[PDB]
């Protein structure tokens, strides 16, 4: 019902030739003319006509016409009338197997793009026609149709069930082309089926036996693409249907071991993944019993840098082998050392740097699983690695930074002058390496060391800050991020020691300079603001000269992220949803300012809409947003409650709804906020207690709840009982056991103090304490340095229980430190 005319054809052919001209500007001119014509449907009818039917014209003009149309599909398919679209569809399927490889590639890319963009529900007979075309006599047609089906399976596998269950016909049919004579078709066949293994697609699982028998029959295929796809198949079958591989495990392991050494590096990388996946299964040790002795040297050998990467310098046989060795070391732990140590001896001291490098990487990879077993060798290895940090080849320096980092805990545990002092000295020198890959390795290692050492670095603080600040001049972009993180960690590790004028004036200027440089859309803000958050908590009162623009920018980031989210929610096809990391980062930095500046932030908050913005952040679908806003709420509750008090009526029900322990961090920050709000509410928190308490009690008696959530729940229940004993005390019998067991283990501080005066007051029902009194006695003995008020309180309840003497039988079940501290402080 549409046919071309010579005038229109000549203009298109003219325009298509012109688009192939070599000249500088005629190409920019032809694109503006295509831009205009692209939105006219009759033009796309001409494009597909040139591709499939103008066999007079050459191949490059025909296929370029098809590719321009492909771009129009990707952009304007919505606007295509159902008569142009059907004409393109029919011509594609009818020329799926053209004799020209370039034309055939172009038709398929059309098919594939219409199928995805425009959605398969709207091309109902595509899959049946493609499947019928698979049975064709002509090879190119069968190959081209299978080419399309494979792209479609890779792109749209998630349409298994409602076209209407097409996989129930295709998958059984793909399995029949595993035996096909042409290796190309065979690859397509198992490539298609591989898309549906992890899904446990019903059509495939009910044919799992035919699948497995056809895979075995294909194992010795000489064509790499088959071997590779057979290897992929076996690795996924390992994850979902281990049951049916079990009777063949010995031959499969034997096969994968051979393929892990394949001459084709892509085959070997697919094979190598088998070991990663097998290590997770509980059957691992039993299965590998006869092959582990060869697997370990095979893995270690593939960890060397390939020759290409050697010259160049992302996932490859090196990383995969290393990852496998890491997991295996975790599975076998010390049993692995007799396999690894001879290799390590032959590699760590080798004359050829590529070999030695791989030795050092082995040493780091096994560190976590084999740590205990290698303690005896560390007094020799660690001084050796510190010497390698000065090795002449950069890649040896950078891997040595890493594996030293993997032994940081052992190093901090030894006398600081022996290993820690020299390691840190030469890591700092390495920070200023001239090679960018070493900078990033040494910086990351140093961060790792900072986290392990904590206050052990305070004597070195000035020299660390000299090195870290200097790096601002040498680093740009990619390692500045690592550098910010090293500064953030330093601030978390030495805390308030950072708060000295010499340090502040050395560190802030370059931090603010990179701050003024970045704009509100740059994701580089994430490490910078997370760094400033840590710096502000450490610098506390000394951050005051810098906080004003820092605060107002964070509130701005939250405000714009909320507004963009609401816009996107309003018209999603016109406005893109915002990255809510900007908001999470910005909330956390405000938490850092409120913790660090304390009361000094109130003048900033008094002039802000942060609480109105916090109200909406607390209700966000995403947990990390809720988690950061509740953390900010507790911090503002401490710093400037004057401004929070009017909002409590609205915040409390929302805090009540986020006492859900499936989200640990949200649940935790919510409970902590409730506690801090209590202390400043006073008796006025009476009406809000029914909204939280019954769940808090359920949370504190829930098994396999992380210790930190339990202590915060204990501290909040204590604080709520200090403030309104009337409605809290009835539950004493129901939570005192886990309360005492958890709070027994926290340092004597203001939260501990606040919580224990709460338990004392709950004086209001002493009968809730009796049947489990052993736990309270222990909990009060946990106190080393209690302030006098709390001591006086403590003597009263213990002496009161005594007077109900007869108790000595019970009191002798005390361990000796328990019984003796109670007599020492309180005289019972």
């Amino acid at each position: 019902e549409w046919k071309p005319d010579e005038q229109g054809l000549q203009q298109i052919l003219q325009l298509l030739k012109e688009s192939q001209s070599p000249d500088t500007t005629i190409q920019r001119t032809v694109q503006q003319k295509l831009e205009q014509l692209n939105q006219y449907p009759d033009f796309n009818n001409y494009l597909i006509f040139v591709l499939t039917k103008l066999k007079s014209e050459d191949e490059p003009t025909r296929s370029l016409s098809g590719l321009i149309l492909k771009n129009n599909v990707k952009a304007h398919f919505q606007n295509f009338p159902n008569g142009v679209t059907d004409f393109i569809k029919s011509e594609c399927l009818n020329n799926i197997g053209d004799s020209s490889p370039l034309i055939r590639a172009t038709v398929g890319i059309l098919i594939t793009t219409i199928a995805s963009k425009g959605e398969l529900q709207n091309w109902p007979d595509l899959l049946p026609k493609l499947c019928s075309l698979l049975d064709s006599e002509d090879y190119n047609t069968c190959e081209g149709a299978f080419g399309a089906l494979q792209k479609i399976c890779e792109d749209s596998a998630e349409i298994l069930d409602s076209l209407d269950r097409p996989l129930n016909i295709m998958i059984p049919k793909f399995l029949q082309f595993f035996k096909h004579s042409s290796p190309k078709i065979r690859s397509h066949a198992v490539a298609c089926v591989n898309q549906f293994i992890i899904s446990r697609t019903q059509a495939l699982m009910l044919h799992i036996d035919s699948f497995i028998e056809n895979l075995f029959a294909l194992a010795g295929d000489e064509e790499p693409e088959v071997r590779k796809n057979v290897c992929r198949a076996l690795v996924m079958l390992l994850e979902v249907r281990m049951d049916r591989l079990l009777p063949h495990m010995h031959n499969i392991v034997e096969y994968m071991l051979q393929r892990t050494q394949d001459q084709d590096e892509n085959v070997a990388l697919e094979a190598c993944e088998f070991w990663l996946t097998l290590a997770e299964q509980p059957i691992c040790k039993d299965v590998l019993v006869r092959h582990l002795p060869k697997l370990i040297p095979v893995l270690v050998n593939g960890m060397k840098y390939s020759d290409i990467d050697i010259i160049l310098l992302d996932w490859n046989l090196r990383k995969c082998s290393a990852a496998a060795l890491d997991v295996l070391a975790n599975v076998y732990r010390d049993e692995l050392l007799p396999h690894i140590l001879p290799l390590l001896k032959e590699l760590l001291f080798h004359h050829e740097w590529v070999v030695k490098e791989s030795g050092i990487l082995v040493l780091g990879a096994i560190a976590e699983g084999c740590m205990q077993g290698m303690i005896p060798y560390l007094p020799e290895l660690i001084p050796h690695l510190i010497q390698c940090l000065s090795d002449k080849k950069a890649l040896v320096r950078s891997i040595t930074c890493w594996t030293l980092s993997r032994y940081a805990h052992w190093v901090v545990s030894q006398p600081p002058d022996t290993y820690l002092k020299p390691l840190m000295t030469e890591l700092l020198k390495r920070i200023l390496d001239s090679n960018k890959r070493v900078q990033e390795a040494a910086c990351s290692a140093f961060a790792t060391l900072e986290e392990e050492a904590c206050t052990e670095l305070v004597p070195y603080l000035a020299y660390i800050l000299d090195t870290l600040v200097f790096a601002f001049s040498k680093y740009q972009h990619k390692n500045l991020l690592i550098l910010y993180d090293a500064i953030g960690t330093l601030a978390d590790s030495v805390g308030h020691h950072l708060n000295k004028p010499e340090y502040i004036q050395m560190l802030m200027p370059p931090l603010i300079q990179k701050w003024n440089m970045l704009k509100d859309e740059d994701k580089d803000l994430f490490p910078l603001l997370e760094c400033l958050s840590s710096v502000a908590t450490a610098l506390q009162s000394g951050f005051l000269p810098y906080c004003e623009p820092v605060y107002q920018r964070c509130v701005n980031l939250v405000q714009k992220t909320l507004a963009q989210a609401m816009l996107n929610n309003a018209q999603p096809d016109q406005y893109e949803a915002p990255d809510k990391d900007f908001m999470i980062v910005a909330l956390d930095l405000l938490s850092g300012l409120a913790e660090g500046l304390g009361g000094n932030i109130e003048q900033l908050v008094a002039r802000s809409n942060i609480l109105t913005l916090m109200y909406q952040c607390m209700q966000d679908k995403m947990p990390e947003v809720r988690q950061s806003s509740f953390a900010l709420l507790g911090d503002l509750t401490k710093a400037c409650f004057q401004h929070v008090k009017p909002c409590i009526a609205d915040f409390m029900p929302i805090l009540g709804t986020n006492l859900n322990p499936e989200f640990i961090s949200v649940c935790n920050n919510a409970t902590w906020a409730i506690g801090e709000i209590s202390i400043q509410m006073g008796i006025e928190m009476q009406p809000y207690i029914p909204m939280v308490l019954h769940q808090l009690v359920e949370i504190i008696n829930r098994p396999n709840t992380p210790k930190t959530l339990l202590e915060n729940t204990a501290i909040t229940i204590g604080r709520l009982g200090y403030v309104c004993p009337q409605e809290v005390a009835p539950m004493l019998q129901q939570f005192i056991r886990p309360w005492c067991t958890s709070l027994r283990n926290i340092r004597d501080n203001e939260e501990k103090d606040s919580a224990f005066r709460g338990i004392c007051t709950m004086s209001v029902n002493p009968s809730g304490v009796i049947q489990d009194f052993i736990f309270f006695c222990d909990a009060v003995a946990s106190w080393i340095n209690p302030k006098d008020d709390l001591r006086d309180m403590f003597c009263k309840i213990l002496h009161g229980f005594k007077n109900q003497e007869n108790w000595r039988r019970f009191s002798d079940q005390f361990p000796l430190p328990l019984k003796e501290r109670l007599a020492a402080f309180y005289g019972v």
């Binding site: 990351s444 690592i482 990390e624």
Partner: peptide, 19 residues
């Protein structure tokens, strides 16, 4: 303690690693 930062996890994930 009291309250969960989640900042350390973010720094660990940006850290350099050979695999």
């Amino acid at each position: 303690p009291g309250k969960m930062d989640s900042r350390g996890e973010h720094r660990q994930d940006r850290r350099e690693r050979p695999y």
